[PDB]
Amino acid sequence: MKPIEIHREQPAQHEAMIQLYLDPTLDWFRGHFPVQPLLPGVAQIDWVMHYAQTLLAPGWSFSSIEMVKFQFPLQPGNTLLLKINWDEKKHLLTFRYDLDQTASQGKIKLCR
Amino acid sequence: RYLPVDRYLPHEAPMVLLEQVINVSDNHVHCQVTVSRDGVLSPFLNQDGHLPGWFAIEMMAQAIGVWSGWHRKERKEADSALGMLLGGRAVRCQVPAFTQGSVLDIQMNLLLQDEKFGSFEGEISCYGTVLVTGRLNTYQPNKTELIQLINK
Numbered sequence: 011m012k013p014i015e016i017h018r019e020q021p022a023q024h025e026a027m028i029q030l031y032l033d034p035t036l037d038w039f040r041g042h043f044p045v046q047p048l049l050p051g052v053a054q055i056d057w058v059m060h061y062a063q064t065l066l067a068p069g070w071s072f073s074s075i076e077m078v079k080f081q082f083p084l085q086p087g088n089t090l091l092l093k094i095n096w097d098e099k100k101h102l103l104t105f106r107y108d109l110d111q112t113a114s115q116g117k118i119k120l121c122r
Numbered sequence: 123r124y125l126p127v128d129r130y131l132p133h134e135a136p137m138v139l140l141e142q143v144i145n146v147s148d149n150h151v152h153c154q155v156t157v158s159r160d161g162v163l164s165p166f167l168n169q170d171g172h173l174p175g176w177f178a179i180e181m182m183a184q185a186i187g188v189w190s191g192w193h194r195k196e197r198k199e200a201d202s203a204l205g206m207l208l209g210g211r212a213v214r215c216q217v218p219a220f221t222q223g224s225v226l227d228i229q230m231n232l233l234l235q236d237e238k239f240g241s242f243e244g245e246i247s248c249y250g251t252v253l254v255t256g257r258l259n260t261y262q263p264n265k266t267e268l269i270q271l272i273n274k
């Protein structure tokens with residue numbers, strides 16, 4: 011379920027930049043779809059939550075997706091740059107996936 | 123009676139995250155799925171045996187997929203081969219995860235639809251208790267349309 015991690019950076023304790031590679035054998039693509047493998051929107055949210063809960067906001071849980079936009083399709087062979095910002099005072103996790111232009115972006119609320 | 127829920131989707135196992143079509147009409151769809159270790163959600167459970175709350179968007183998206191699939195089949199139209207989620211708005215969950223054993227009712231109401239684009243408001247409930255509300259936008263492109271999108 012997790013993609014291949016090429017590199018991670020953390021320029022502040024509340025920010026992360028992760029370079030990810032989508033392999034053809036990634037199980038998200040299985041049956042999604044026969045005519046074209048496409049990365050589901052939920053998988054992009056899933057990884058945001060993994061890096062958020064492990065690097066940025068440990069002990070915080072999912073509450074809502076206030077807004078998400080998927081504006082470009084992603085397929086195997088793509089390299090992604092994932093940028094995440096955690097604003098603890100706002101309870102607000104913001105993210106953007108860029109093709110290594112912007113593939114997706116959103117705002118998630120967490121609760122403790 | 124309805125076909126198996128996978129028959130209304132371009133999706134195939136293991137990426138079909140619903141188990142039962144309960145009802146479909148011109149402006150509504152009701153589908154069902156159970157949070158179990160033996161069912162379609164088992165690959166997506168967290169270390170504690172629960173389905174994370176954010177999978178609500180995918181269950182809601184697929185319910186919209188079932189809606190469009192059913193209507194294409196009633197209209198003797200070609201099966202869709204692709205489905206895309208374009209966006210979600212205020213997808214708010216009362217719990218961080220759906221507990222093992224929960225029977226989930228996914229109920230979507232049509233706002234706006236055309237050939238390819240769809241806009242739906244949604245609710246996930248468990249025995250009448252509302253656990254998630256939200257709005258979703260979807261897109262059902264041709265394979266050629268998708269190639270043009272990818273390349274142009």
Ligand code: NA
Binds near residue numbers: 131132134
């Ligand atoms: Na199918």
